[PDB]
Structures are given as C-alpha cells and as structure tokens.
Amino acid sequence: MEEEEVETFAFQAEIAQLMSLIINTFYSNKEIFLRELISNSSDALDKIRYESLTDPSKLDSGKELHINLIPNKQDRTLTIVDTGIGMTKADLINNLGTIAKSGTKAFMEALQAGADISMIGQFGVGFYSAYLVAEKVTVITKHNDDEQYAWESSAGGSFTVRTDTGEPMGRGTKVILHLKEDQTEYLEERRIKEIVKKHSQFIGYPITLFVE
Numbered sequence: 725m726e727e728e729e730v731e732t733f734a735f736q737a738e739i740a741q742l743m744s745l746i747i748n749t750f751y752s753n754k755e756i757f758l759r760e761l762i763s764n765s766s767d768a769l770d771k772i773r774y775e776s777l778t779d780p781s782k783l784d785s786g787k788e789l790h791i792n793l794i795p796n797k798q799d800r801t802l803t804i805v806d807t808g809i810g811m812t813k814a815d816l817i818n819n820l821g822t823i824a825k826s827g828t829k830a831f832m833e834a835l836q837a838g839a840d841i842s843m844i845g846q847f848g849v850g851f852y853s854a855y856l857v858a859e860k861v862t863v864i865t866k867h868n869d870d871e872q873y874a875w876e877s878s879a880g881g882s883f884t885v886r887t888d889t890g891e892p893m894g895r896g897t898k899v900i901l902h903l904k905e906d907q908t909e910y911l912e913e914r915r916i917k918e919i920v921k922k923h924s925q926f927i928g929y930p931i932t933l934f935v936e
C-alpha cells in the first residue's frame with residue numbers, strides 16, 4: 725500500500741469569486757484557455773533556461789524542452805505536459821490560490837462591462853480560464869528541490885495539494901483537464917490544431933499533438 729498526505733486550502737477571497745464567475749457565466753472565446761496553459765508552460769521553460777546561470781548543473785539534463793498536447797476521447801480529458809522548471813509545494817500554494825493577485829477585482833469588473841475573457845492573462849489570473857471547459861482540473865508538478873505533487877480543484881471554494889505517488893513525471897508540470905460534456909470539441913485533432921495556429925503560433929518551444 726502507498727500513502728499520500730493531503731492539504732485543503734481556502735481560495736483567496738477574490739480568486740474564489742472569479743472562479744464562480746467563470747463557471748456560471750457563458751463566454752466563448754473559451755478556446756483561449758489553451759493559449760494560457762501553453763504560455764505558463766512556456767514561462768516554466770524560460771526559467772529552466774535562465775536557472776542555468778545560478779545553477780550550471782541544470783545544463784546536464786538530457787531532457788528536451790517542449791510542450792505536449794494529449795486528447796483522450798475515451799476518458800474525456802485533454803492534458804498539457806511540459807518539461808519546464810516545475811513547482812515546489814510553496815510555489816503551488818502561493819501561485820495557484822492562496823495569495824492575492826492585484827488584478828483580480830479589476831478583471832471581474834472589466835468582464836462585467838463585457839470585456840473579452842481573452843483579457844484574463846494580462847490581469848494576472850490566466851489559469852482560471854481552464855474552468856471555461858473543465859469541470860475539474862488536476863495539476864501534477866515536479867521540481868528539483870522537492871517531491872511530486874498533485875493540485876486539484878473542482879472549484880467550490882477550495883483546493884487540495886497532496887504528495888503524488890502516481891506515475892513519476894520527472895521535471896515539469898502536467899495539467900489535466902476533465903472536460904464538461906459539451907466541450908468535447910477540444911478532443912478533436914482539427915479543433916486542437918486550429919487554436920494553436922491561431923493563438924500560440926509564436927511560442928519558442930516545440931508543441932506536439934498526440935492522436936488516437
């Protein structure tokens with residue numbers, strides 16, 4: 725038998741309000757969610773490249789810096805996998821819910837004035853777009869300093885962080901989107917290629933689509 729430690733955290737007040745706003749209001753442009761995830765994946769990769777200045781040991785990695793997309797129609801999930809820096813426990817808690825973001829209220833205000841959900845990234849809260857198409861989000865992450873963790877929230881006010889004892893993934897972050905029944909278009913290969921070409925064409929790393 726294996727064992728994992730679980731922690732439940734409250735979402736910062738305005739993050740929780742934002743998550744409600746997304747989950748219960750219709751928008752679409754929803755496809756911008758993929759660009760946000762690829763962008764964050766791209767930053768984690770930039771950090772790996774710069775960390776080398778403070779830790780030359782990083783250069784010794786055989787791992788290729790890239791982004792993989794994996795649609796699974798049998799399970800109704802879309803997974804975005806990167807080989808970036810990863811996130812320690814503190815990084816997950818601080819950056820995925822617990823700390824205030826100075827752009828949160830302003831964004832909820834812009835949205836109420838009909839601004840496009842596509843502005844989410846420039847307000848400092850782009851990750852919560854994942855909730856435009858997913859009823860539950862699992863974030864598997866592995867950083868050099870620390871253990872592998874899984875973050876998870878079906879929304880509802882909180883999120884748990886636990887030490888992941890599942891399949892090791894090596895350095896990086898894996899975002900697993902459990903799609904709402906009506907968002908199945910994001911499992912199709914033609915739909916997937918359309919939004920990448922459309923929103924993530926200038927990304928500096930290889931992006932790969934795995935089909936079937």
Ligand SMILES: CC(C)(C)c1cc(C(=O)N2CCOCC2)ccc1O
Pocket residue numbers: 760761762764765766767768771806808809810811815819820851863865896897899
């Ligand atoms: C936080 C989230 C889920 C948006 C995300 C984080 C990373 C990640 O590992 N980060 C740590 C290093 O700095 C960039 C974010 C990579 C992809 C991704 O979608």
